[PDB]
């Protein structure tokens, strides 16, 4: 667990970025401001700030009685829900660090997380993302992967029930210091990202300012709450610390979510592009009343200008583009930015002390507007992954810059434009091709729902291109789309060598497209 050198600590405290409260103290402060206001809602249950705080304290007492102590680690694998929030904040109070596993994670990942972190417990549910994790949890215990397995819901011994632990008398003490690790986030087997209370609260508080969160923010969880976008950018925690209300959802389909928005008067949410595409193309479901919606954050992957330009007309809300990473840096377009920035950039950095360097293969800083590897250090960017000295020696420069693996350029005013991952690059007979440019043209096509362009081996040109396209009916042929690209003025060498009409793309844990999976499919 590498830390910030002393010069940086001192400057981030002097700047006022790092304050002296833990997550638990911060929620308690917010609760005290508005104790009866509804803080969380699910399909039936609604908790006031004061009821949430008390339940968290009661769960904390129960977890302590069950053996969880300050400095312990747990693997937290729960669907979106009230239990996720309660359990997180109870662990924050106790100084117990949760590994924030995603709903899509399975035994390979879960086992690795328990083992690598030496978790005392796995905390899970009777069901998650269509998966029954209780067999796995039994094997975790049988193999020594963790000591204990708590299940919210029904489960057979040797698994233990989480609900009885809420019956304890409320623990009133906090064991967490602002400089301690609060939780382990996960890289997008995922690496463990040690996030500390004071820096990750800076992340939350400043994001909430930039995104205009306030007492009236009604935040819908469009993504897994474990994920950093959903949790802190500004996320669920930004909503709670602004004294807003969080509306939980275990699904992001526009059918369900549009009705929730109407029911709860949702004002804010966050999505990855593929989900935003579904919301933009939702047909009869758009009969819903979405008048309450004020801000749609889109991030995780680039939202091209063809799609971005449809957000305000179709949904009636402002768009914000978010370039983010669990390791640190967040860039945001700002709520008062002109369209040219919101449609065509992925934001500018959150903190004045975020230090960004775009560098070529040699480590040279590129010229302005030129494309290079994004690297960065700053007041909420880690200095290394948890207990990973050998990987850390490659992933961080000697002066402490995190090497993101993304290819970006910068515009005149500091805004980042993401070309994609280093591994997404296409070189077609020595001509370079920016997938995003071709993807954005195809996505503008009226019978194209989404598109993704990747590299395939070729003996003569080294690489050719293949575009995967989800049609909307009536679906165009590959030949019609090649002609449509031509009529748009796309350079000939950039027209995909191959276009695959398909109903869906493989997806990552939170819904991003897996170009790795596509590129392994081709070869
Ligand atoms: N607007 C964008 N345009 C192009 N690419 C983007 C991108 N936003 C992310 N990426 C890619 O996603 C990696 C990080 O992924 S992440 O840890 O899961 N966390 C997130 O995505 C995340 C998103 C929002 C807020 C907090 C977060 O933590 C990045 O290095 C980069 O490759």
Is 254 within 8 Å of 284 (Cβ atoms)?
A: no
Segments in 346-477 forming alpha helices (H): 389-395, 435-443
Looking at ligand 1, which atom is closest to the CA of residue 299?
Answer: 1
Q: Single out the residue of 143, 352, 322 nearest to residue 227, CA to CA.
A: 322
Is 300 within 8 Å of 319 (Cβ atoms)?
A: no
Listed in sequence order, the residues at least 6 apart from 249 whose beta carbon sits closer than 8 Å to its beta carbon are 80, 220, 221, 222, 256, 257, 260
Q: Does the bond joining 158 to the residue before it have cis omega, within 30 degrees of 0?
A: yes
Block residue for tokens 């440019």:
437
Helix (H, G, I), strand (E, B) or coil at 352: coil
Q: Single out the residue of 48, 231, 252 nearest to residue 261, CA to CA.
A: 252
Q: What DSSP letter does each residue of 274-320 carry, written as one string?
A: HHHHHHHH--GGGGS--TT--EEEEESS---HHHHHHHHHHH-SEEE
Query: Ligand 1 atom 14: the closest Cα is on which residue?
Result: 325
Q: Where the chain is broken, by preceding residue (C–N > 2.5 Å)? A: 188
Rounded Cα distance, 398 and 402, in Å: 10
Q: What DSSP letter does each residue of 369-397 carry, written as one string?
A: T--EEEEEE-TTS-SS-TT-HHHHHHHB-
Domain ranges of the chain: 18-176, 177-346, 347-422, 423-523
Listed in sequence order, the residues at least 6 apart from 471 whose beta carbon sits closer than 8 Å to its beta carbon are 447, 448, 449, 501
Helix (H, G, I), strand (E, B) or coil at 466: strand
Sheet holding 318-325, edge to edge: 46-48, 38-41, 245-247, 218-220, 268-271, 295-299, 318-325, 328-332, 348-349
Q: Which method, experimentally, gave rise to this model?
A: X-ray
Is 140 within 8 Å of 122 (Cβ atoms)?
A: yes
C-alpha distances in angstroms, 286 versus 55, 259, 275, 295, 449? 37, 9, 15, 17, 16
Strand 148-152 to 160-161 pairing = parallel
Q: Single out the residue of 35, 19, 21 nearest to residue 240, CA to CA.
A: 35
Task: Give me the resolution in angstroms, 1 decimal.
Answer: 2.1
Residue 333, H or E segment: none
Block residue for tokens 């596509």:
518
Work out the angle between the directed axes of helices 435-443 and 478-487 (0-180°, nearest 10).
100
Q: Single out the residue of 377, 487, 407 nearest to residue 8, CA to CA.
A: 377
A 10 A CB-CB count for 30 gives 22
Q: Does the bond joining 234 to the residue before it have cis omega, within 30 degrees of 0?
A: yes
Is 503 within 8 Å of 469 (Cβ atoms)?
A: no
| Substitution site in 229, 300, 345, 382 for ligand 1 pocket (most atoms within 8 Å of beta carbon) | 300
Rounded Cα distance, 26 and 449, in Å: 42
Work out the angle between the directed axes of helices 23-33 and 49-65 (0-180°, nearest 10).
150
87 lines ligand 1 (CB under 6 A): no
For ligand 1, the distance from its centroid to the CA atom of residue 484, given in whole angstroms, is: 31
Looking at ligand 1, which atom is closest to the CA of residue 510?
Answer: 18
Block residue for tokens 């001192």:
10
Query: Ligand 1 atom 13: the closest Cα is on which residue?
Result: 325
Rounded Cα distance, 351 and 154, in Å: 45
DSSP letter assigned to residue 406:
E
Give the CA angle between residues 111, 42, 245 to the nearest 5°.
105
Give the CA angle between residues 211, 215, 218 to the nearest 5°.
70
Question: What is the Cα Rg of the chain in Å?
Answer: 23
Rounded Cα distance, 104 and 135, in Å: 16
Is 270 within 8 Å of 302 (Cβ atoms)?
A: no
DSSP letter assigned to residue 493:
G
Listed in sequence order, the residues at least 6 apart from 175 whose beta carbon sits closer than 8 Å to its beta carbon are 70, 93, 94, 95
Rounded Cα distance, 100 and 75, in Å: 7
Residue 220 bridge partners (DSSP): 247, 269
Helix (H, G, I), strand (E, B) or coil at 80: coil
Query: Ligand 1 atom 5: the closest Cα is on which residue?
Result: 301
Query: Ligand 1 atom 32: the closest Cα is on which residue?
Result: 406
DSSP letter assigned to residue 164:
G
Give the CA angle between residues 316, 319, 320 to the nearest 5°.
160
Q: Single out the residue of 427, 444, 517, 434 nearest to residue 485, CA to CA.
A: 444
Q: What DSSP letter does each residue of 180-212 carry, written as one string?
A: SEEEEEE---PPEEEEEHHHHHHHHHHHHHHHT
223 lines ligand 1 (CB under 6 A): no
Work out the angle between the directed axes of helices 305-315 and 435-443 (0-180°, nearest 10).
40
For ligand 1, the distance from its centroid to the CA atom of residue 474, given in whole angstroms, is: 33
Phi, psi of 270 (to 5 degrees): -140, 135
Q: Single out the residue of 402, 409, 406, 343 nearest to residue 375, CA to CA.
A: 402
For ligand 1, the distance from its centroid to the CA atom of residue 25, given in whole angstroms, is: 29
Task: Please state the length of the chain.
Answer: 523
Block residue for tokens 């070869």:
523
Looking at ligand 1, which atom is closest to the CA of residue 270?
Answer: 24
Residue 469 bridge partners (DSSP): 451, 501
For ligand 1, the distance from its centroid to the CA atom of residue 323, given in whole angstroms, is: 5
Q: Does the bond joining 471 to the residue before it have cis omega, within 30 degrees of 0?
A: no
């Amino acid at each position: 667990a590498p830390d910030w050198p002393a010069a940086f600590v001192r400057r981030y405290l002097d700047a006022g970025h790092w304050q002296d409260q833990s997550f638990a103290e911060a929620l308690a402060t917010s609760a005290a401001r508005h104790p009866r206001r509804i803080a969380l809602c699910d399909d039936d249950q609604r908790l006031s700030y004061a009821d949430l705080l008390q339940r968290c304290r009661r769960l904390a007492a129960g977890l302590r009685q069950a053996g969880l102590a300050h400095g312990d680690t747990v693997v937290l694998h729960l669907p979106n829900g009230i239990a996720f929030v309660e359990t997180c904040f109870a662990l924050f109070q106790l100084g117990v660090r949760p590994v924030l596993a995603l709903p899509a994670h399975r035994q390979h990942e879960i086992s690795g997380f328990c083992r690598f972190a030496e978790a005392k417990a796995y905390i899970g549910a009777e069901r998650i993302d269509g998966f029954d994790p209780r067999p796995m949890a039994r094997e975790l215990l049988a193999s020594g992967a963790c000591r204990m397995a708590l299940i919210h819901g029904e489960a057979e011994a040797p698994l233990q029930a989480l609900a009885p632990l809420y019956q304890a008398d409320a623990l009133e003490d906090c064991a967490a210091r602002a400089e301690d690790i609060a939780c382990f986030q996960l890289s997008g087997t995922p690496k463990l990202i040690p996030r500390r209370h004071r820096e990750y609260l800076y992340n939350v508080r400043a994001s909430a300012e930039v995104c205009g969160f306030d007492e009236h923010t009604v935040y819908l969880t469009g993504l897994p709450m474990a994920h950093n976008f959903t949790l802190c950018c500004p996320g669920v925690i930004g909503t709670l610390l602004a004294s807003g209300r969080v509306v939980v959802s275990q699904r992001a389909d526009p059918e369900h979510c549009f009705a929730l928005i109407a029911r709860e008067r949702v004002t804010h949410t966050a999505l990855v592009p593929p989900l935003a595409m579904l919301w933009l193309d939702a047909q009869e479901s758009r009969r819903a009343d979405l008048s309450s919606l004020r801000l749609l954050q889109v991030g995780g992957s680039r939202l091209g200008s063809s799609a971005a330009q449809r957000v305000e007309p179709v949904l009636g809300c402002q768009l914000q583009q978010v370039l983010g990473m669990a390791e640190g840096l967040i860039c945001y377009t700002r709520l008062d930015d002109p369209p040219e920035r919101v449609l065509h950039t992925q934001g500018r950095p959150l903190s004045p002390d975020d230090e960004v360097r775009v560098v070529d293969a040699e480590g040279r800083e590129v010229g302005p507007g030129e494309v290079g590897e994004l690297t960065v250090r700053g007041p909420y960017t880690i200095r290394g992954y948890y207990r990973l000295p050998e990987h850390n020696a490659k992933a961080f420069s000697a002066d402490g810059f995190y090497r993101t693996g993304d290819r970006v350029s910068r515009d005149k005013d500091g805004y980042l434009v993401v070309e994609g991952r280093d591994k997404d690059q296409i070189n077609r007979g020595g001509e370079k091709i920016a997938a995003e440019e071709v993807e954005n043209l195809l996505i503008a096509h009226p019978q194209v729902h989404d598109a993704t362009v990747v590299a395939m081996p070729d003996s003569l040109l080294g690489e050719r291109t293949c575009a995967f396209v989800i049609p909307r009916q009536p679906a165009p042929s590959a030949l019609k789309l090649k002609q449509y690209l031509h009529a748009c003025g796309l350079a000939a060498f950039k027209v995909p060598d191959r276009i695959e009409l398909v109903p869906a793309f493989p997806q990552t844990g939170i819904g991003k497209i897996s170009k790795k999976d596509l590129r392994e499919r081709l070869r």
